[PDB]
């Protein structure tokens, strides 16, 4: 048809128009019809994404782990899991600082059981009900086992396995195309989502919110410059060269608010910049759900906002408790637009800011509005975290 442009341009066109349109209408009469007519064209987008998160989690790992020999998995597995966890802890620390510096939120005044649940009691039940991390466990296990079999002596299993491995790898690829298909519908959805927001904007409505948005976006820029450039220069990468390519990937997530749908793009980029097949196949899909630096930061800052409004001044011991709980939530969260705030309640109940009080939900409701904006920045940082950790490893290897 007439829609044959490259994808990214259509999305940038749709986003601009949605911002302008939403405002001019906000003033004038028809500001509450968008909620009635437009919004579905946004909800209909979200649901398409959640659909395709799981299948590409399960499959891509199985295919990724089986190809790599067991030995090489140890090196690239240990190295990465290290890089993913630490940086996620550094970031949340970097956010706490920024909250004390800006000081938002004036207003008016089992730990083992979780680390144990990552083993599924029944796999097909977790695969369905929604549990994310357990499927990462069973996926890896099944990828390693298929490896030993293909070397087995009896010619029946050596055939059986391959067919199994050929099926799944067939499943994934199907999902990579579905993604490309959705994106064509994205620009409409993008236009709607932002529009409904501007009709009910929160930016600069009050000094509190304004500070929040600045406290975050500053931390996210300090996160990139301070941490990533440091590391890249140490190992011997030219950053601006690295960022240059990444701009195609970063832009797509910024507007779209998804770490998964961008996945095929990211893997397209990595080849242009010359990384090896086996390493990026494994680390990218793993990194999407596990490595969420930016989500952590937002979860630390918001927690301090809620606490500062209540006046629940935080001793050191619980500040570490925030750090540790924020890391876990960034992992369990799924990687689609709304998941980031849902778990923010987890950390809150962990420290003891219970949702039973109406005041907290009022404070919570405030963050939830602006959350629409913050979602665009959060995703940009996360995707770069994956490309960075990948390039590092491919260097030493």
Q: Which of 247, 241, 179 is nearest to 384 (CA)?
A: 247
Residue closer to ligand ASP (CB basis): 53 or 322:
53
Residue closer to ligand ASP (CB basis): 18 or 294:
294
- Let me know: does 385 contact 291? Beta carbons within 8 Å: yes
User: At what angle are helices 358-396 and 207-222 packed, to 10 degrees?
Assistant: 10
Residue closer to ligand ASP (CB basis): 263 or 366:
263
* Six-digit token string for 319: 């500040």
160 assigned binding-site residue: no
Cα gap 18→29, rounded to integer Å: 17
**Residue 53 CB, nearest distance to ligand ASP (Å)?**
10
Is the sign of the CA dihedral 246, 252, 257, 260 positive or negative?
Answer: negative
382 assigned binding-site residue: yes
Residue 319 burial (10 A CB sphere; 0-12, 13-18, 19+): middle
169 assigned binding-site residue: no
Residue closer to ligand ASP (CB basis): 379 or 388:
379
386 assigned binding-site residue: yes
Residue closer to ligand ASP (CB basis): 53 or 126:
53
Cα gap 327→312, rounded to integer Å: 22
166 assigned binding-site residue: no
181 assigned binding-site residue: no
Query: How long is the chain?
Result: 397
**Residue 312 CB, nearest distance to ligand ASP (Å)?**
24
**Residue 375 CB, nearest distance to ligand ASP (Å)?**
5
Q: Which residues bind ligand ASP (CB under 6 A)?
A: 258-259, 292, 295, 335-337, 339-340, 375, 378-379, 382
**Residue 288 CB, nearest distance to ligand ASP (Å)?**
7
**Residue 296 CB, nearest distance to ligand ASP (Å)?**
10
Q: Which of 267, 386, 281, 266 is nearest to 66 (CA)?
A: 281
Cα gap 185→366, rounded to integer Å: 30
Q: Which residues are annotated as a binding site for L-aspartate?
A: 257-259, 295, 336, 375, 382
């Amino acid at each position: 048809k007439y829609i044959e442009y490259p994808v990214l341009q259509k999305i940038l066109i749709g986003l601009i128009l949605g911002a302008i349109v939403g405002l001019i209408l906000g003033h004038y009469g028809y500001a509450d019809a968008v909620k009635t007519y437009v919004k579905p064209f946004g909800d209909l987008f979200v649901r398409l994404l959640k659909m395709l998160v799981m299948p590409i989690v399960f499959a891509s790992l199985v295919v990724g782990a089986a190809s790599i020999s067991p030995a090489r998995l140890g090196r690239v597995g240990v190295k990465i899991v290290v890089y993913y966890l630490l940086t996620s802890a550094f970031a949340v620390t970097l956010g706490i600082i920024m909250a004390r510096l800006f000081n938002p939120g004036a207003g008016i005044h089992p730990l083992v059981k979780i680390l144990l649940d990552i083993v599924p009691t029944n796999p097909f039940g977790a695969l369905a009900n929604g549990q994310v991390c357990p499927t990462i466990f069973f996926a890896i296990i099944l990828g390693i086992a298929i490896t030993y079999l293909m070397n087995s002596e009896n010619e029946k299993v050596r055939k059986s396995a391959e067919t199994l491995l050929d099926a799944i790898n067939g499943l994934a690829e199907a999902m990579y195309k579905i993604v490309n298909g959705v994106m064509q519908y994205a620009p409409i959805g993008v236009f709607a989502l932002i529009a409904y927001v501007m009709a009910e904007q929160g930016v600069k409505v009050v000094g509190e919110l304004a500070k929040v948005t600045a406290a975050v976006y500053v931390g996210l820029t300090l996160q990139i410059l301070l941490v990533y450039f440091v590391l890249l220069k140490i190992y011997g990468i030219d950053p601006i060269s690295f960022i240059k390519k990444a701009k195609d990937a970063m832009l797509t997530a910024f507007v779209t608010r998804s770490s998964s749908g961008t996945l095929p793009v990211t893997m397209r980029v990595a080849k242009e910049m010359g990384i090896s097949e086996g390493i990026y196949s494994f680390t990218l899909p793993l990194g999407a759900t596990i490595n969420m630096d930016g989500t952590a930061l937002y979860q630390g800052v918001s927690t301090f906002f809620i606490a500062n409004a209540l006046g629940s001044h935080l001793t050191v011991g619980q500040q570490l408790t925030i750090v540790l709980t924020a890391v876990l939530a960034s992992i369990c969260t799924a990687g689609v637009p709304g998941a980031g705030a849902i778990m923010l309640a987890m950390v809150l109940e962990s420290v003891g800011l219970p949702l039973t009080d109406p005041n907290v939900a009022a404070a919570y409701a405030m963050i939830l509005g602006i959350d629409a904006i913050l979602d665009m920045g959060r995703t940009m940082v996360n995707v770069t975290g994956d490309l960075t950790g990948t390039a590092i490893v491919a260097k030493t290897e």
